[PDB]
Amino acid sequence: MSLLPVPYTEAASLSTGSTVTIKGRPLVCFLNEPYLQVDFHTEMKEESDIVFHFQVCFGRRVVMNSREYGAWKQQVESKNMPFQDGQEFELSISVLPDKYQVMVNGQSSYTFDHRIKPEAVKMVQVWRDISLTKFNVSYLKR
Amino acid sequence: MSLLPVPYTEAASLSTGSTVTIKGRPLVCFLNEPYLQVDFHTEMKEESDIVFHFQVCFGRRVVMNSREYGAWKQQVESKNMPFQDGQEFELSISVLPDKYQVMVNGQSSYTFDHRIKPEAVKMVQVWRDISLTKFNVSYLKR
Ligand SMILES: CC(=O)N[C@@H]1[C@@H](O)[C@@H](O)[C@@H](CO)O[C@H]1O
Numbered sequence: 654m655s656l657l658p659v660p661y662t663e664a665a666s667l668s669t670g671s672t673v674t675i676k677g678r679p680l681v682c683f684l685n686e687p688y689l690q691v692d693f694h695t696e697m698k699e700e701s702d703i704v705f706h707f708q709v710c711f712g713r714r715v716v717m718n719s720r721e722y723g724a725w726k727q728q729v730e731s732k733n734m735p736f737q738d739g740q741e742f743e744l745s746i747s748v749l750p751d752k753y754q755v756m757v758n759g760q761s762s763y764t765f766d767h768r769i770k771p772e773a774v775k776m777v778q779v780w781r782d783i784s785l786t787k788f789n790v791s792y793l794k795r
Numbered sequence: 796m797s798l799l800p801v802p803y804t805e806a807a808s809l810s811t812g813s814t815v816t817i818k819g820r821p822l823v824c825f826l827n828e829p830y831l832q833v834d835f836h837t838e839m840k841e842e843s844d845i846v847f848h849f850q851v852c853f854g855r856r857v858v859m860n861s862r863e864y865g866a867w868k869q870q871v872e873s874k875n876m877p878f879q880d881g882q883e884f885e886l887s888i889s890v891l892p893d894k895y896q897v898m899v900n901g902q903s904s905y906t907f908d909h910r911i912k913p914e915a916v917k918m919v920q921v922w923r924d925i926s927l928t929k930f931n932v933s934y935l936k937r
C-alpha cells in the first residue's frame with residue numbers, strides 16, 4: 654500500500670499495554686549498511702529528550718539508549734539481527750510494566766527496561782534508511 | 796527549488812577536472828546526528844565496489860574509504876566539521892590527478908588520494924538523512 658513520509662512524526666501517548674506497530678523495508682541492501690531509528694520523544698520538538706532510542710545498523714548491530722536532559726545515558730548494544738536482507742519487516746514495540754519489548758516479524762528480539770515513565774512520551778519519530786507502509790499506536794487500555 | 800529523490804542515483808563518468816556538485820540540507824538538527832553518504836560506484840548495482848566513500852555524521856566526524864572486491868579498505872577519519880547546524884550545504888568534489896578534493900560551502904575540507912582510477916566510476920549515489928535540491932557532474936574536459 655501507500656508510502657508514509659520518512660522521517661515520520663506522530664504525536665503519541667504510551668501506557669502499559671500500548672503497542673507501536675511499524676511496517677517498512679530498508680532502502681538498500683545490507684552490504685551498504687542502511688540504518689533504522691525509532692525515537693520515543695518527550696515533546697513534539699526533535700531536540701526533545703528520548704525515553705527510548707532504538708537504532709538498527711541492518712546486518713551488524715542494534716543500540717538502545719535514552720537521552721535525558723540533552724545527554725545520552727548507558728548504551729545497550731545487541732548483535733541480535735532478525736532483520737532479513739532485502740525484506741519487508743514488521744516491528745512491534747509493546748509497553749510492559751517494567752520494559753519495552755521489541756518483536757521483529759513476530760519474534761521477541763530486544764527488551765529495554767523503563768528509565769523514564771512511558772507517560773512522559775508525547776511523540777514518536779521513525780527515520781533513516783527505510784520506506785514505511787504502516788505506523789500504528791494502539792489506544793485500547795485505561 | 797524542487798527536491799530530487801533520496802536515495803539519489805545518477806550514471807556518471809569521472810576523469811581529471813570532473814566536478815560533482817551537491818546542494819542539500821540535513822533532515823534534522825545535529826543533536827539527532829543525521830548522516831550524509833556519497834558513494835562513487837564502479838557499476839549501477841548498489842552492491843558494486845566503491846572507489847570513494849564519503850560519510851558525514853553531522854556535528855561529529857567524517858569517514859572516507861573504498862570498498863574493493865566487496866571489502867572495506869583503510870578508513871580515514873576526520874573531525875573537521877565545516878557543516879553548520881540547520882543550514883543548506885554546497886558540497887563540490889573535484890577529481891585532481893592524485894586525489895579527490897572535497898569543498899564544503901567553498902572551503903577545502905577533505906582530500907582522498909586515488910586508490911582506483913576514477914575512470915572505474917560508473918555511478919554516484921547520494922543518500923542518508925538529507926534533502927537534495929542540486930546534483931551535477933561536469934563533463935567539460937577531454
Ligand atoms: C527537559 C528538558 O528541558 N530537556 C532539554 C531538551 O528539550 C533540549 O532543550 C536539550 C538540548 O540539549 O536539553 C535538554 O536538557
Ligand SMILES: CC(=O)N[C@@H]1[C@@H](O)[C@@H](O)[C@@H](CO)O[C@H]1O
Pocket residue numbers: 842843844863864865866
Ligand atoms: C569487481 C567485483 O566483482 N566486485 C564484487 C561486487 O560487484 C559485489 O558482487 C561484491 C559483493 O560482496 O563482491 C565484489 O567482489
